[PDB]
Write a protein that binds this ligand. Structure first.
Ligand code: ZN
Ligand code: ZN
Lengths: 240, 102, 212, 127, 357, 145, 35, 39, 89
């Protein structure tokens, strides 16, 4: 084992000559890059350890385990502002990749920075990424109890994914809380938009039947059978 | 059946870390800013010294658990199979790969 | 001189094909003393192949065989492919089916030689690289303990650097090698830079004293 | 909403969306004849100055066949004539010129957003 | 409608998924007449890898191939004029000059050669590519050529002095296709790093990097009018507006899989030859796939042989010469006496499920 | 000549020596371009998640298919994905067209006596004996069918 | 008999119909010479 | 080992930063110094 | 860029007191002291009858990155050495 600093200085030269030799022959082999970048973290020289990950990103910046390991290397040494810059370059280079967005979130979740995940989610849901992002963004506000904020999301979420399983998710939100004045307002908005946008042909016959039935069976539980009954006539006439 | 795509597995591992973060807040309950520079465009965020240690220790501990789970999986992988003749560990490792293909 | 096959040589040949493959028969005969690469190929393709068909004769098989030997008279390599069977077995049963109408002392040393040759896979270049790497570390271990024993006497002698092979050879210990600094970030890593430098300088102070 | 801009500034939604989808008759004009000539005469003058650099620097004597002073310094405090030295035809011209090899750093000031679309992603074990 | 803007009150009123979708149904694509096979030419000993047309007077086309030889075919009768040997590996791209009687051809043997078509001999060879060269493009009105290949660089060659004048260094993979336009950006390139670059050849740097494709951008094609390029990855074809680098339109290429070639017509017909043999014709200004054909290989060949490798239109634009892997050259005629009625093509039906638009 | 000799003394030789193709290294450069074309077409048929490991294993089926072709052994991998088996057979036939046509071309040179290398006479003998048996084995199956 | 369905002309070409020295582009000779 | 397939080709990015040598090749000697233009 | 190159960074006190200075340009003169890579050697004399040739020792890129002159390698403003400059800041 290493005794003094001069034996350490000769130990570090032998490994760094070795690893830089295999990376000179193989620019590729991302696993070889990380094992030499992990070596420099063990030597407690983070200036070198940042450099190998930066050099490895110049070879293959689309390799996701390389991004996560360099982010985790900045987090394990408590360099939080080095990680914020790094995850910012992660999501600005590869905005499609879901892992890089969830990595930004659960670190700022871990720091209880609720205004930074909210600013992050507003940007991420502006690029129209998919239903996994929005559903984790409506689950974020339920944690924060922001009931007025999560109602603003479903206003935008039905405009990004116009389909009944996003509209019926919003009425499963409102009927979970029992607010009757808010639920039929969503129900009135959902059935008018099918009528307003009839010519676009984006809701199928089986798909509009889920909206009419879930409207009617809710009105049956609200003891107003005459509204349950009349909407069946307008829907059959509106769609014969 | 199928494998899990990298969008779902990112979501599921996101939810597991939220549940684990929720129980850390539950256990911390039971046991008891942004300033932008004028000179530069650089931005400064006030943080507690806790929850940065707690994130770093958690990332280290998860790395320990996954390392030892794979290490124990290494132990089982070289102690289970002994039927086919081999030459080294890498032979049995490659012929486990051919058994996985069947 | 034409030998018969012992069960020892039978097992060496099966393990040889398992490693070398079916087309390298001079590789197989190298393990197998007293036997020819032709003889090794002939046995595996007539006897030892587990794909071959050494079993009982259903009455479909006997009717098919007497059909084929009547339609293709005396063409046994053809018939054995139509029957998907070995050929002299197919003759042996056709000989029998018509008779229905009636009115270690040395070997283990070869096996010890075969057991070692199958389990040594490297060649000249890899075994030599192993030897040079073990001898290089042995020279390294020698020079370090030299320096420690001189340090026992108090007289300090530094480790010599490796000699440059070519002109622009890089001392990787000397400098940050190809310093690709990270892109300038907005979140202001200023307190973090101070704490790593203090922690890295603290780490270098620990190595001089306690020795890692 | 304390830092609304400073997350992923280089990527916008407008880069994803097509432009002919709003009107199929959007006019992308061809370059005008006065515009190709301003670009040709700039390109041809730049490349002819490059070919003359390669031919003059070659040691072949038969390459002049096929082919800036008084600059200001110190905020024009000193007018300085720039002249050339008459080279010895036997000494090697370009004394600092060797065949040496250089690795080059990459200048990365801005990140290029890799603008794919989202996600038809279901797949069995067929591949 | 106005209901969406008064209730779901937007900040842009275009960036909704509905307001984009209703404008696609509000517009109809131009009708184009369908295409049919007219002549099959069997002359090569290997695959046909590249086809170039005579840019002046339109008499002949030339097909470099996998049997290392370029053959010159008459366009009208289909007969064989001459054979140009002189590469030792497969000819990958062929370009004929309009201002010159010069024929430029690259191959996988690292060679870029010029050909005096008044003499049919190799003159003026070029040197410097580290690996095999894949494409040629002759600059209009500058006397350059642009070659690129597996070296991830674009060498801009002076014709007369044979000098690698400008090397454009930006890519990360082998370059599949290169184009030359008369104004900035004067070189358009596509490589296997899923990028399309727009080059400023005087500075030697990229004006705009187009990172929109997912996989290797195998083929681009310049529009003869309206100043745009269309690039084809392994399923998505995207038309690009040069001088801004703007994504003009996103085509309806679904399950096309590996497009081996593109060619754009004067009449806004975009061809997309795929490796699966399925060749499809699109409306250029809209993106509507209005015809999808499949080819027949030969009397006997493999099922992989049904693949279009290279394609061009002639100068009139009414003919489509495609070279395929079955050692054949197929000429595709857009049939006359078809109307908007009785030959509508495929129906214009955009969807929300595909996020293409 | 001496001007290149003296400038090589004062400056050293250039590091950018790009070797042209030659008769010496035509079979080697043919394979480097054939392996890149197969590695491209398979990596584009892949849906996702393919790395330098998975691209490395698939190119060995290309080599195994060419050895089965020369042996006239049917190359059938159980569990092979049918688009990828379609790609490899497309290029094995592509290499086979060059392999056979070079055997016809060099045979005509040996009869004329027109400067064939001593190695190539042994190589052309080795190519025709595979073509003769492959024509022989095919003639055996046409009688059998 | 022949594939592709009789609208398609299939032709197999194994010999050149031009001389190799025939110029593929005719040379521009403006002034008439009598030498 | 020691006999390997290429994972990638030698890029022209590396030769672009090198300093030139200016050695005189026989095939870069001046020849066909006049271009022919089409009518 | 070999045909587009910056003008040389030289001090005022290197040039001295005279108005017009005849400077000699050699396009690939010596190699840099710092980067060991060739550059355009400028050299000149203060007066016509001087006896000391003042050469540019470093290239313009090494002179820009340090913000020093090419001849005496002092800082362009403040005219101090680099080691004293980085100690005052
Ligand atoms: Zn310098
Ligand atoms: Zn000075």
């Amino acid at each position: 084992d290493i005794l003094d600093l001069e034996e350490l200085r000769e130990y570090q030269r032998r490994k760094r000559t070795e690893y830089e030799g295999y990376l000179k022959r193989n620019r590729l082999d991302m696993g070889q890059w990380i094992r030499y970048a992990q070596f420099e973290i063990e030597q407690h020289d983070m200036r070198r350890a940042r450099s190998i990950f930066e050099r490895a990103l110049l070879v293959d910046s689309s390799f996701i385990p390389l991004w996560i390991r360099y982010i985790d290397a900045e987090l394990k040494v408590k360099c939080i502002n080095h990680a914020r810059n790094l995850m910012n370059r992660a999501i600005s280079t590869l905005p499609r990749v879901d892992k890089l967005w969830y990595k930004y979130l659960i670190v700022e979740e871990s720091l209880n920075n609720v205004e930074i995940v909210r600013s992050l989610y507003t940007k991420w849901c502006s690029l129209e990424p998919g239903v996994n992002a929005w559903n984790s963004f409506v689950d974020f506000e339920i944690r924060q109890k922001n009931w007025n904020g999560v109602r603003e999301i479903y206003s935008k979420y039905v405009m990004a994914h116009p389909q009944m399983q996003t509209w019926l998710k919003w009425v499963r939100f409102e009927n979970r809380h029992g607010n009757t004045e808010f639920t039929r307002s969503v129900y009135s908005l959902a059935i008018d938009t099918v009528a307003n946008l009839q010519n676009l042909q984006i809701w199928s016959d089986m798909e509009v039947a889920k909206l009419v039935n879930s409207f009617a069976h809710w009105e049956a539980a609200q003891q107003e059978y005459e509204r349950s009954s009349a909407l069946y006539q307008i829907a059959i006439e509106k769609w014969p | 059946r199928g494998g899990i795509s990298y969008d779902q597995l990112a979501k599921l591992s996101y939810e597991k870390t939220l549940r684990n973060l929720a129980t850390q807040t539950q256990n911390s309950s039971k046991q008891d800013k942004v300033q932008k520079d004028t000179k530069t465009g650089k931005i400064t965020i006030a943080d507690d010294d806790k929850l940065v240690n707690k994130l770093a220790v958690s990332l280290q501990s998860e790395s320990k658990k996954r390392y030892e789970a794979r290490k124990r999986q290494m132990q089982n992988a070289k102690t289970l199979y002994g039927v086919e003749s081999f030459i080294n560990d890498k032979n049995k490792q490659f012929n486990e790969k051919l058994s996985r293909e069947s | 001189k034409g030998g018969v096959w012992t069960n020892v040589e039978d097992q060496i040949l099966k393990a040889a094909v398992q490693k070398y493959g079916t087309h390298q028969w001079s590789k197989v005969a190298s393990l197998l003393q007293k036997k020819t690469a032709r003889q090794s190929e002939l046995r595996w393709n007539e006897y030892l192949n587990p794909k071959l068909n050494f079993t009982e004769f259903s009455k479909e098989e006997d009717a098919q065989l007497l059909d084929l030997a009547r339609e293709l008279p005396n063409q046994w390599r053809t018939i054995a492919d139509m029957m998907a069977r070995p050929a002299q077995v197919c003759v042996e049963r056709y000989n029998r089916l018509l008779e229905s109408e009636d009115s270690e002392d040395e070997e283990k040393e070869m096996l010890a030689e075969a057991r070692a040759r199958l389990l040594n896979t490297q060649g000249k270049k890899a075994t030599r690289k192993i030897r040079e790497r073990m001898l290089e570390e042995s020279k390294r271990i020698a020079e370090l303990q030299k320096r420690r024993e001189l340090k026992q006497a108090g007289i300090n002698v530094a480790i010599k650097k490796p000699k440059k092979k070519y002109g622009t050879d890089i001392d990787y210990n000397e400098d940050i090698v190809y310093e690709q600094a990270p892109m300038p970030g907005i979140y202001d890593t200023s307190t973090e830079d101070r704490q790593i430098k203090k922690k890295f300088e603290q780490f270098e102070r620990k190595v001089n004293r306690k020795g890692l | 909403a304390i830092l609304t801009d400073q997350i992923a500034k280089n990527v916008k939604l407008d880069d994803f969306i097509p432009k002919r989808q709003s009107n199929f008759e959007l006019s992308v004009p061809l370059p005008t004849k006065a515009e190709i000539q301003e670009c040709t005469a700039r390109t041809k003058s730049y490349i002819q100055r490059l070919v003359n650099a390669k031919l003059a620097n070659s040691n072949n004597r038969a390459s002049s066949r096929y082919v800036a002073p008084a600059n200001l310094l110190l905020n024009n405090s000193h007018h300085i004539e720039v002249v050339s030295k008459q080279m010895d035809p036997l000494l090697p011209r370009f004394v600092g010129k060797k065949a040496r090899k250089v690795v080059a750093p990459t200048e990365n000031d801005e990140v290029v957003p890799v603008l794919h679309m989202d996600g038809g992603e279901a797949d069995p074990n067929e591949w | 409608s106005a209901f969406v803007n008064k209730i779901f009150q937007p900040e842009v009123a275009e960036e909704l998924i509905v307001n984009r979708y209703e404008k696609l149904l509000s517009q109809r694509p131009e009708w184009h007449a369908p295409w049919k096979l007219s002549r099959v030419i069997n002359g090569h000993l290997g695959w046909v890898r590249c086809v170039a047309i005579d840019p002046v007077d339109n008499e002949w086309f030339i097909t470099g191939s996998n049997d290392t030889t370029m053959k010159v075919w008459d366009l009208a009768t289909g007969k064989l004029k001459t054979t140009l040997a002189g590469h030792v590996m497969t000819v990958r791209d062929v370009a004929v000059s309009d201002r010159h009687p010069y024929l430029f051809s690259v191959s996988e043997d690292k060679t870029v050669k010029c050909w005096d078509l008044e003499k049919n001999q190799i003159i003026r060879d070029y040197y410097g590519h580290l690996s095999g060269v894949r494409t040629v493009s002759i600059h209009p009105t500058l006397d350059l050529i642009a070659t690129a290949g597996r070296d991830s660089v674009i060498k801009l060659w002076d014709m007369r002095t044979r000098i690698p004048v400008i090397t454009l260094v930006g890519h990360k993979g082998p370059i599949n296709q290169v184009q030359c336009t008369p104004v900035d950006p004067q070189v358009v390139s596509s490589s296997t790093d899923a990028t399309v670059r727009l080059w400023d050849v005087v500075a030697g740097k990229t004006m705009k990097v187009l990172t929109h494709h997912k996989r290797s951008v195998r083929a681009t094609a310049l529009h003869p009018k309206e100043f745009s390029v269309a690039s084809a990855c392994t399923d998505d074809i995207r038309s690009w507006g040069l001088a801004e680098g703007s994504l003009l339109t996103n085509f309806e290429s679904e399950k096309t899989g590996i497009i081996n070639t593109l060619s754009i017509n004067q009449d806004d017909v975009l061809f997309a030859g795929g490796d699966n043999g399925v060749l499809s014709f699109y409306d250029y200004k809209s993106g509507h796939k209005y015809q999808s054909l499949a080819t027949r290989e030969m009397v006997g060949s493999l099922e992989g042989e049904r693949s279009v490798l290279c394609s061009t239109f002639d100068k009139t634009g009414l003919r489509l010469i495609t070279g395929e892997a079955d050692k054949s050259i197929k000429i595709w005629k857009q049939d006359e006496t078809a109307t908007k009625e009785s030959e509508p093509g495929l129906a214009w039906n955009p969807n929300l499920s595909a996020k293409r638009f | 000549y001496i001007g290149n000799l003296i400038t090589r003394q004062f400056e050293g030789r250039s590091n950018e020596i790009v070797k042209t193709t030659t008769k010496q290294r035509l079979d080697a450069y043919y394979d480097l371009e054939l392996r890149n074309s197969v590695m491209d077409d398979i990596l584009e048929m892949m849906p996702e998640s393919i790395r330098q490991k998975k691209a490395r294993t698939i190119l060995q089926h290309l080599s195994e298919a060419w050895r089965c072709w020369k042996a006239n052994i049917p190359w059938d991998v159980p569990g092979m994905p049918a688009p990828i088996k379609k790609i490899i057979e497309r290029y094995i036939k592509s290499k086979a067209d060059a392999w056979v046509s070079a055997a016809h071309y060099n045979r005509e040179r040996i009869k004329r006596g027109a400067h064939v290398e001593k190695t190539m006479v042994k190589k052309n003998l080795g190519r025709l004996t595979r073509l003769w048996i492959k024509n022989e084995q095919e003639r055996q199956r046409q009688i059998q069918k | 008999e022949h594939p592709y369905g009789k609208e398609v002309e299939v032709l197999m070409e194994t010999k050149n119909t031009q001389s190799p020295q025939t110029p593929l582009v005719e040379p521009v000779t403006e002034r008439t010479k009598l030498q | 080992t020691s006999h390997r397939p290429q994972l990638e080709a030698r890029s022209g990015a590396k030769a672009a930063a090198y300093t030139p040598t200016g050695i005189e090749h026989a095939r870069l000697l001046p020849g066909h110094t006049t271009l022919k233009y089409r009518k | 860029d070999e045909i587009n190159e910056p003008p040389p960074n030289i001090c005022e006190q290197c040039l001295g007191d005279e108005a017009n200075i005849r400077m000699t340009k050699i396009p690939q003169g010596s190699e840099c002291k710092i980067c060991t890579l060739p550059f355009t050697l400028y050299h000149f004399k203060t007066s016509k009858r001087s006896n000391n040739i003042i050469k540019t020792l470093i290239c313009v890129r090494c002179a820009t990155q340090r913000n020093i002159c090419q001849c005496c390698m002092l800082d362009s403003r403040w005219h101090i050495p680099i080691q004293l400059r980085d100690h005052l800041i």
